[PDB]
């Protein structure tokens, strides 16, 4: 009784902290995208604008790590209430220790304020001529910031009604259904598989094309892959497994992203073509009407084919009585074609009769 009030109060606290972790997680990503794009041409890494925006990212990282710590503290309190424990140490299992530190490590990677540079040497594409540049270290930290998109999966899980409803929990309990993040994803692939596979593809299309562009701008002076629409074409053709054309990443960051694009592009392509294949198939009710209408059409076609069989049969006989040779043979040839066409419509009608009886 009192556990229900505490559990539902911690559910709303965890849900509220997940939203705030998403607000600051995506704010840091948005500012990182702006800062990376602007610091290329608009200003430099040593400008006061670079320090100001990178301090905004760092401040949002401190807040995000604060909300991750507090959210995992609510998971400890929820664990103690769920399992009846009263000591927080009991909840601190090796699996939980690893994942709390893993989320902190993922969310603590950001472009630390201050200009630090490292020597980037990459082998150019289609020419194999090495090119070296003094790229900033903040590109090694801007790209991993996209790992914060896992907070979207947490917000969706904590906001789904199947995870926070009393009726869903009771009904699922009677069938012993494990309600977790996998179940919500599986149900999302049955309600709206097309929308899930389209908001996923056309969102990481820009995320990956920007990651390739932001990585292949230090090693691209010809505006080939550093172009946004060039990288959007590269990521799309690699997604569809068509190829690379002349657009091959000159860095192992672009090659790596074109590898994750090809991996998720071998699965998402198969799942999309398996969804558009389930939407072009007649339902159980629609197929019954279609086979009902084709039975009427085949019934009429059998009448007209058998009528042709008899019509050409009488033409053969009448011309035979008229002692004709060329005309009688022409209608005899037509009689065999009428009989063959009558057999064809009879066989394809019985193919329908076996089809209606199968279901």
């Amino acid at each position: 009784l009192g556990a229900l009030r505490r559990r539902r109060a911690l559910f709303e606290k965890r849900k509220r902290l997940s939203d705030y972790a998403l607000i600051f997680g995506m704010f840091g990503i948005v500012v990182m995208v702006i800062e990376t794009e602007l610091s290329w041409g608009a200003y430099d890494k040593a400008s006061l604008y670079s320090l100001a925006l990178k301090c905004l990212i760092s401040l949002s990282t401190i807040i995000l790590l604060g909300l991750i710590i507090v959210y995992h503290a609510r998971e400890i309190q929820l664990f103690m209430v769920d399992n009846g424990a009263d000591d927080w140490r009991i909840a601190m299992t090796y699996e939980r220790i690893f994942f709390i530190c893993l989320e902190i490590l993922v969310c603590a990677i950001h472009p630390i304020p201050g200009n630090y540079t490292f020597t980037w040497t990459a082998r150019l594409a289609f020419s194999y001529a090495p090119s070296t540049t003094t790229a900033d270290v903040d590109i090694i930290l801007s790209i991993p910031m996209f790992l914060r998109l896992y907070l979207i999966a947490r917000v969706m899980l904590l906001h789904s009604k199947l995870f926070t409803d009393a009726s869903s929990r009771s009904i699922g309990a009677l069938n012993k259904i494990n309600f977790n993040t996998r179940f919500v994803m599986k149900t999302l692939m049955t309600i709206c598989p097309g929308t899930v596979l389209l908001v996923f593809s056309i969102s990481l299309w820009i995320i990956a094309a920007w990651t390739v562009r932001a990585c292949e701008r230090y090693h691209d002076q010809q505006d080939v892959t550093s172009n946004f629409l060039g990288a959007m074409w590269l990521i799309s053709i690699t997604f569809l497994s068509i190829g690379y054309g002349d657009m091959v990443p000159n860095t192992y960051c672009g090659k790596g992203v074109c590898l994750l694009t090809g991996i998720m592009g071998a699965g998402c392509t198969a799942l999309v073509v398996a969804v558009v294949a389930r939407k072009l198939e007649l339902t159980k009710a629609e197929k019954h009407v279609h086979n009902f209408m084709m039975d009427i059409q085949y019934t009429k076609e059998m009448k007209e084919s058998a009528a042709r069989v008899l019509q050409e049969a009488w033409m053969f006989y009448k011309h035979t009585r008229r002692k004709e040779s060329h005309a009688a043979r022409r209608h005899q040839r037509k009689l065999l074609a009428a009989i063959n066409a009558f057999r064809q419509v009879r066989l394809k009608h019985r193919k329908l009769r076996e089809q209606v009886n199968s279901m």
Binding site: K303, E304, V309, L310, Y317
Partner: protein
Amino acid sequence: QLTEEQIAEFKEAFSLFDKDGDGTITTKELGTVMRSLGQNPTEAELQDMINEVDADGNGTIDFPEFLTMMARKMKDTDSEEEIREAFRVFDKDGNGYISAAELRHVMTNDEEVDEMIREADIDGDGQVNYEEFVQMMT
């Protein structure tokens, strides 16, 4: 007569249709064979089919009769069955006869059909039967 290999193969097919080896294809054996083929034939339909080739009318199928059935069915398309099925699908009432009004109806999917009917009723009973249908077919 057929060669030894053909006769041997035809007797092999007869053994397929004759499980008990008595030399005659009874109704029960045909029913079991057709049920082994996934079909669900009724007793009346199977009896109608089994006398479709029964020359002697004894109700069972012997080897020469099976040879006749094969000689009809070994070809890619047999015209006899097609003519019979056309006659059957012409029979809306199922009585085995087609009236002049029925012919007029099946022609809409007047003098020519009248001349055809007058030339088709060889026995002059005022209607067209199956033998008249096959005579007009050939």
